[PDB]
Amino acid sequence: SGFRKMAFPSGKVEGCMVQVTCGTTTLNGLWLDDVVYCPRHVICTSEDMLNPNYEDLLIRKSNHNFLVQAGNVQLRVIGHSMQNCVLKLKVDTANPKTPKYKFVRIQPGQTFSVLACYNGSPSGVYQCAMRPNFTIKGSFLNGSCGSVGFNIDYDCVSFCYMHHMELPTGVHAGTDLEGNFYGPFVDRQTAQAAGTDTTITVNVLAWLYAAVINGDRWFLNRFTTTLNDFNLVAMKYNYEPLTQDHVDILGPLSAQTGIAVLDMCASLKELLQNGMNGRTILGSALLEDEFTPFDVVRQCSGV
Amino acid sequence: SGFRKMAFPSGKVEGCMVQVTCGTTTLNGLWLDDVVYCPRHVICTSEDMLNPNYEDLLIRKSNHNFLVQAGNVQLRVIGHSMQNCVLKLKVDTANPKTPKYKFVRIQPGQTFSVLACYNGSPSGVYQCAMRPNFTIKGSFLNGSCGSVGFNIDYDCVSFCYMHHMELPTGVHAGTDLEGNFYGPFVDRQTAQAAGTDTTITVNVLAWLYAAVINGDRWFLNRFTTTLNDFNLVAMKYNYEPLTQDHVDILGPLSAQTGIAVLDMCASLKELLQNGMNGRTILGSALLEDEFTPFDVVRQCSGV
Numbered sequence: 386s387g388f389r390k391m392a393f394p395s396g397k398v399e400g401c402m403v404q405v406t407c408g409t410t411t412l413n414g415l416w417l418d419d420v421v422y423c424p425r426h427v428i429c430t431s432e433d434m435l436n437p438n439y440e441d442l443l444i445r446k447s448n449h450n451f452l453v454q455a456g457n458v459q460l461r462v463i464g465h466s467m468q469n470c471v472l473k474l475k476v477d478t479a480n481p482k483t484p485k486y487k488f489v490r491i492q493p494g495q496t497f498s499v500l501a502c503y504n505g506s507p508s509g510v511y512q513c514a515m516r517p518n519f520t521i522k523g524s525f526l527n528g529s530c531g532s533v534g535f536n537i538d539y540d541c542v543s544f545c546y547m548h549h550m551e552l553p554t555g556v557h558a559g560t561d562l563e564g565n566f567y568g569p570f571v572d573r574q575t576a577q578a579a580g581t582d583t584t585i586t587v588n589v590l591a592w593l594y595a596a597v598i599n600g601d602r603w604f605l606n607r608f609t610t611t612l613n614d615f616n617l618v619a620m621k622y623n624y625e626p627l628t629q630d631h632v633d634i635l636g637p638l639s640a641q642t643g644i645a646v647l648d649m650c651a652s653l654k655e656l657l658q659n660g661m662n663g664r665t666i667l668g669s670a671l672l673e674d675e676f677t678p679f680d681v682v683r684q685c686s687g688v
Numbered sequence: 689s690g691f692r693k694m695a696f697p698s699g700k701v702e703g704c705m706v707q708v709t710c711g712t713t714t715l716n717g718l719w720l721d722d723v724v725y726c727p728r729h730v731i732c733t734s735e736d737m738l739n740p741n742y743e744d745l746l747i748r749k750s751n752h753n754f755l756v757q758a759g760n761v762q763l764r765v766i767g768h769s770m771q772n773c774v775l776k777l778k779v780d781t782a783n784p785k786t787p788k789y790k791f792v793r794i795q796p797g798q799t800f801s802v803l804a805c806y807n808g809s810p811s812g813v814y815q816c817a818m819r820p821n822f823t824i825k826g827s828f829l830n831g832s833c834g835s836v837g838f839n840i841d842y843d844c845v846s847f848c849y850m851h852h853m854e855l856p857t858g859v860h861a862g863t864d865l866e867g868n869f870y871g872p873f874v875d876r877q878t879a880q881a882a883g884t885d886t887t888i889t890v891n892v893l894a895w896l897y898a899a900v901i902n903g904d905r906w907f908l909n910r911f912t913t914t915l916n917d918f919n920l921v922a923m924k925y926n927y928e929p930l931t932q933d934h935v936d937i938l939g940p941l942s943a944q945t946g947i948a949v950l951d952m953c954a955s956l957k958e959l960l961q962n963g964m965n966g967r968t969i970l971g972s973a974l975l976e977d978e979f980t981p982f983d984v985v986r987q988c989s990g991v
């Protein structure tokens with residue numbers, strides 16, 4: 386037993402990380418087959434980054450302006466193109482460590498592992514949730530751009546995120562691997578703000594089920610509520626509305642615990658109104674919303 | 689910026705995980721050069737596990753009783769020996785993916801990454817701190833024994849933990865890679881309890897420095913205190929005493945922030961007496977003690 390925020394093992398992605406240099410800018414790239422993917426802002430300069438025309442910038446580049454390094458071995462670039470906000474550098478060697486992979490775009494409320502990298506070298510792994518406002522709460526320093534987010538399913542890596550920037554509030558923004566931003570953001574140094582966020586209700590309920598499975602029961606009660614009455618409380622506390630689909634996805638956890646979803650919703654209602662009164666749930670004194678039902682089932686089915 | 693609990697990239701350890709089967713018991717082993725290390729309780733049966741004599745149990749085994757599998761490829765065992773609570777199975781192939789490594793024993797208050805594995809296959813990575821009472825707060829199901837904990841330093845893996853069991857409170861216990869338990873525990877199914885725990889004061893202070901570096905300042909104040917006066921408050925709240933060595937290790941963080949350690953200690957004193965009053969620090973509503981000064985410097989020096 387135990388419930389811990391847990392990343393996927395990063396080995397399959399570590400074998401894909403390279404370093405991409407253009408001019409005096411160095412960041413990370415993702416080397417799959419004979420193509421390296423990286424943020425297109427690597428071709429910007431200190432003065433371009435205010436409002437650059439990337440099509441003009443790329444037309445003025447040649448293959449020899451791109452220094453790619455897989456460890457010590459330099460990779461020769463034989464072509465370059467832009468796909469939305471990602472640059473694709475064709476190289477003369479197919480990555481022999483290329484895993485089975487997909488490029489997927491994820492939904493707000495879903496989680497993924499981030500492999501934070503600097504100079505093409507992995508440094509750390511951690512879990513992120515895509516917030517309703519399309520930001521993530523990461524840990525990224527200068528040099529981390531091109532770090533990717535991913536999930537793994539039966540040795541197939543589904544890449545869903547490439548890191549591009551930090552917003553003024555300290556949260557992070559990036560693209561899918563097609564180069565399309567998550568959220569209403571652009572890859573330039575301007576005044577950008579994330580919209581207001583909300584709490585991911587189905588995830589909070591999944592985590593309360595994780596808590597029960599691990600022996601935290603103090604917040605339970607004999608009451609049940611209705612879906613419409615719960616969504617009234619959700620609106621007041623800036624929680625997302627609970628849908629019948631969410632109730633269905635929580636079915637397995639409700640079955641394992643014998644606690645109906647609308648039974649657990651009554652507990653959440655009371656936690657929102659009364660707080661915790663000095664107690665904790667799974668080691669937290671706040672309601673946690675960054676664990677999906679899948680994340681919980683992954684760790685709690687055996688218990 | 690940002691501060692996130694972060695594991696080391698797990699690739700170097702993934703390449704060392706195998707599956708070890710003896711009888712009807714399957715767990716994980718660590719394959720380094722031509723030796724596989726795993727918990728010796730793999731040679732126990734359902735009735736042996738109450739109070740087994742492991743020396744007798746191993747004398748009655750032969751090499752062919754041990755099924756080792758590195759993925760699909762079965763590894764042939766050519767020798768077996770016991771070192772304290774770990775079994776060493778000699779195999780006829782040196783692991784070609786063996787990293788540079790050390791076996792180190794860690795101290796209470798220090799952290800490490802855990803690569804949770806089942807059937808020799810890695811499933812997740814997360815950070816743990818060795819508690820003062822020599823337990824860890826992990827996430828381990830049946831089949832996870834033989835999963836290891838490690839730190840990485842310049843492509844050298846320092847292995848410090850192998851998982852053996854779960855205590856009645858749900859926390860976890862294991863050995864170093866020499867087979868010596870952390871804490872006053874034994875590898876059999878009996879009545880074992882962890883002693884009382886305490887809070888790791890130097891780690892809480894390191895995390896408060898991380899908070900300041902990331903823009904959380906609401907808990908700061910103009911006051912400073914003395915080391916002896918702070919340790920009086922530490923005793924009352926079940927915190928470990930602060931030593932001058934701890935003050936010295938926090939030197940870099942105090943320099944980066946301009947906040948003396950005894951200045952930060954006054955803030956902790958007030959947090960312990962007054963609580964947070966509905967506010968959070970780095971996304972937590974509790975004082976976090978599982979980040980070492982090293983962990984903080986790793987993520988916060990660039991900010």
Ligand SMILES: *[C@H](O)[C@H](C[C@@H]1CCNC1=O)NC(=O)[C@H](CC(C)C)NC(=O)OCc1cccc(C(F)(F)F)c1
Binds near residue numbers: 527528530551573689
């Ligand atoms: C790419 O490595 C970098 C990643 C940033 C740096 C700090 N944290 C991150 O996530 N991305 C950028 O620097 C990005 C580039 C423009 C889109 C062209 N701009 C950006 O994030 O500016 C915001 C910012 C905030 C704090 C610190 C920095 C600094 F590190 F660049 F100084 C930048």
Ligand SMILES: *[C@H](O)[C@H](C[C@@H]1CCNC1=O)NC(=O)[C@H](CC(C)C)NC(=O)OCc1cccc(C(F)(F)F)c1
Binds near residue numbers: 874
């Ligand atoms: C080895 O894979 C296993 C790891 C345990 C199982 C559940 N969580 C863990 O960390 N270790 C044992 O099963 C261990 C073996 C003895 C030392 C010989 N015994 C043990 O942990 O018993 C406690 C326990 C608690 C909850 C659930 C179990 C169960 F999974 F075995 F049923 C065991």
Ligand code: NA
Binds near residue numbers: 608647648649
């Ligand atoms: Na209820």
Ligand code: NA
Binds near residue numbers: 952
């Ligand atoms: Na102070």
